[PDB]
């Protein structure tokens, strides 16, 4: 399983 | 799945 | 601001 | 699908 | 202001 | 800021 | 920045 | 097994 | 940068 | 055994 | 770039 | 035996 | 036997 | 690219 | 005799 | 693209 | 896609 | 006799 | 007589 | 899909 977590500032 | 939620001020 | 929402199901 | 909706003050 | 609407298929 | 969270099981 | 960790099973 | 560890800045 | 390492037994 | 080792920029 | 080396026994 | 050797830009 | 020869850019 | 060569003798 | 002919895009 | 050709006599 | 045609004798 | 006819996409 | 009829996905 | 049909007299 690949767990993803965080945030982005731009598209 | 990977959920996406929030906002951006630039591209 | 540009609202961003939804999901990336296929990667 | 990642839906996007709003407005930017500059590029 | 630049209106931005739509969706991303592959993020 | 856009929150990215979740999981990719199959690539 | 978005942290990604884990394992790919279905390639 | 394919192990993953790191980060993405935009996706 | 997402670091990738390991082995593919099957897909 | 197909071995893997390196780094990616996107998912 | 992800270096990939090795062999498949049963294709 | 099916031998494999080289590099991929992404998974 | 069945011979295999060429290249791939993805897995 | 990942070079692929060899043979599948047992199937 | 089983004759095989063609090409693959992925491993 | 990987070329697959040849024959399987015994399974 | 890889065409496979013919007959199995040694099962 | 065991007759075979068709195709494989990955092997 | 052992009869056979169907379809397979791999070899 | 590889279509299979026929009879096994012996193996």
UniProtKB/Swiss-Prot annotation, chains A, B, C, D, E, F, G, H, I, J, K, L, M, N, O, P, Q, R, S, T:
Q: How is it modified after translation?
A: The ditryptophan cross-link at Trp-5 is responsible for the non-disulfide-linked homodimerization. Such modification might only occur in extreme conditions and additional experimental evidence is required. Palmitoylation helps nuclear targeting and decreases catalytic activity.
State the source organism's domain of life: Eukaryota
Check the UniProt entry and state the signal peptide residues, or none. none
Query: Where's the 1-(tryptophan-3-yl)-tryptophan (Trp-Trp) (interchain with W-33) crosslink?
Result: 5
Its annotated compartments are: Cytoplasm; Nucleus
Q: What else is known?
A: The protein (both wild-type and ALS1 variants) has a tendency to form fibrillar aggregates in the absence of the intramolecular disulfide bond or of bound zinc ions. These aggregates may have cytotoxic effects. Zinc binding promotes dimerization and stabilizes the native form.
Q: Which disease is it linked to?
A: Amyotrophic lateral sclerosis 1: A neurodegenerative disorder affecting upper motor neurons in the brain and lower motor neurons in the brain stem and spinal cord, resulting in fatal paralysis. Sensory abnormalities are absent. The pathologic hallmarks of the disease include pallor of the corticospinal tract due to loss of motor neurons, presence of ubiquitin-positive inclusions within surviving motor neurons, and deposition of pathologic aggregates. The etiology of amyotrophic lateral sclerosis is likely to be multifactorial, involving both genetic and environmental factors. Spastic tetraplegia and axial hypotonia, progressive: An autosomal recessive, neurologic disorder characterized by loss of motor abilities in the first year of life, after which severe, progressive spastic tetraparesis develops. Affected individuals have severe axial hypotonia, hyperekplexia, hypertonia, and myokymia, reflecting upper motor neuron involvement. Cognitive development may be affected.
Q: What does this protein do?
A: Destroys radicals which are normally produced within the cells and which are toxic to biological systems.
Q: Which family does it belong to?
A: Belongs to the Cu-Zn superoxide dismutase family.
Complex formation: Homodimer; non-disulfide-linked. Homodimerization may take place via the ditryptophan cross-link at Trp-5. Heterodimer with SOD1. The heterodimer CCS:SOD1 interacts with SLC31A1; this heterotrimer is Cu(1+)-mediated and its maintenance is regulated through SOD1 activation. Interacts with DAOA; the interaction is direct.
Protein name as it appears in the record: Superoxide dismutase [Cu-Zn]
Source organism: Homo sapiens
Gene that encodes the chain: SOD1
> Fragment boundaries within the full protein?
29 to 39 of 154
């Amino acid at each position: 399983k690949v767990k993803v977590w965080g945030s982005i500032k731009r598209l």
